[PDB]
Amino acid sequence: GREFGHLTRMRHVITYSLSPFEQRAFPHYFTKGIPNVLRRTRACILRVAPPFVVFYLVYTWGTQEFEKSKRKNPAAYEN
């Protein structure tokens, strides 16, 4: 029963549209797009990135302590 004439109630709202053949498919692309994708990067960088930094530090400590527990023996190797 979810068809287009039966969805919700709406009053006093006007929309304006242009034909696709009357406009250019590529407007401002590097004038608007490059400043837009940079503040989107700034808005999410403090939430996503600090977990993946802690994975990097655990990975380096885990592969380096694996080798000098195994056959890397400078000075604890006496009688």
Partner: protein, 378 residues
């Protein structure tokens, strides 16, 4: 008198794909549901070829697969389409589940519960396809399942003997693994039509978490052309992994044949099981390890009950976004640990990361939503 609104078969297609009301702000994260339907169809028209030229026995399995790459015409392309097409299915499945976890799509209760059944069925299928080529990774990976499957205290010793063909490694082992692998992809195809029939009752969620009944658009042509473009970008990545590095996702030791000849230098499955192998290996008890394996996938069913936020999605919840990406970084750690030997630094790390996977979902996420409720004065 419009034939696509009155014909008995055409009006089912029209309500499902053409005239369907859809939110206008749907992102590219909503593309991966139709990508999963492309990967499932592709694994059916390629598993046709392999089961045609196949013999599954303890004496000829390793050579029945090497016959296809050299002798069977167009067999090298179709075999590595099938081995990399299953890695493509599993990356499109983990994106799909993490979407619905992030945006609160689990509040569609019936659609979410059929999804958890679909995650179990493809995981058990792919386990019974890697045992078919019969190499070192096929043997020693199957023979650690049955150690935890015979640990079932009453019925387990006659359960494993009923599925091993009758005794142990023999000719008829690969007649019950192969039977449980030909027919399980078709229960998935019927469980996917039921999965979409429950979603059709409400329509789709959107990235804001607010209902969008005042801003719907038709599905054709806006998301029919957007799903075709996203599928073309998936075929480019898949054919690059097949025609330029077809052994990048794989293990060389599974080219060494299967025999109880000698213990291998390591034991590791494919990349999409390494998070699960790391959890059971960090439990020194073959009953506690088989319980935490099933509790790592069936914990998704408790996500509707553990929800304590007044909002639906995570778009306006900055403290909950930090915990979601800590969970993703915790599954990267378990995928790395599960391909490492069982030595000193990889037991204290692999068992603390097994704890934190359950601590985030059960304890840390419900308390943090309550703290964010108090900060917004509700």
């Amino acid at each position: 008198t419009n034939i696509r609104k009155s014909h008995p078969l055409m009006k089912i297609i029209n309500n499902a794909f053409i005239d369907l009301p859809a939110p206008s702000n749907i992102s590219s994260w909503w593309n991966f549901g139709s990508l999963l339907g492309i990967c499932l169809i592709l694994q059916i028209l390629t598993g046709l070829f392999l089961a045609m030229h196949y013999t599954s026995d303890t004496t000829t399995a390793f050579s029945s697969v090497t016959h296809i790459c050299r002798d069977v015409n167009y067999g090298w392309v179709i075999r590595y389409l099938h081995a990399n097409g299953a890695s493509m299915f599993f990356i499109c499945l983990f994106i799909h589940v993490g979407r619905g976890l992030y945006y609160g799509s689990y509040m569609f209760l019936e659609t979410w519960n059929i999804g958890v059944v679909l995650l179990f069925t493809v995981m058990a299928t792919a386990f019974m396809g890697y045992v078919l080529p019969w190499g070192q990774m096929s043997f020693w990976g199957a023979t650690v399942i049955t150690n935890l499957l015979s640990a079932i205290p009453y019925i387990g010793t006659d359960l494993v003997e009923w599925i091993w063909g009758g005794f142990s490694v023999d000719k008829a082992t690969l007649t019950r693994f192969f039977a449980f692998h030909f027919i399980l992809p078709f229960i998935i195809t019927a469980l996917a039509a039921v999965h979409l029939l429950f979603l059709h009752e409400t329509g789709s969620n959107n990235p804001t978490g607010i209902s969008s009944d005042m801003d719907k658009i038709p599905f054709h042509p806006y998301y029919t052309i957007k799903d075709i473009l996203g599928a073309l970008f998936m075929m480019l990545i898949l054919l690059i992994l097949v025609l330029f590095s077809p052994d990048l996702l794989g293990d060389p030791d599974n080219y060494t044949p299967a025999n109880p000849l000698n213990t291998p230098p390591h034991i590791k499955p494919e990349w999409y099981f390494l998070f699960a192998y790391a959890i059971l290996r960090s439990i020194p008890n073959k009953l506690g390890g088989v319980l935490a394996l099933v509790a790592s996938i069936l914990i998704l069913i408790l996500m509707p009950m553990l929800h304590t936020s007044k909002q639906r999605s995570m778009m306006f919840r900055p403290l909950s976004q930090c915990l979601f990406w800590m969970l993703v970084a915790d599954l990267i750690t378990l995928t790395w640990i599960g391909g490492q030997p069982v030595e000193h630094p990889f037991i204290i790390i692999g068992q603390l990361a097994s704890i934190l996977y359950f601590l985030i979902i059960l304890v840390l996420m419900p308390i943090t939503s309550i703290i964010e409720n108090n900060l917004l004065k509700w």
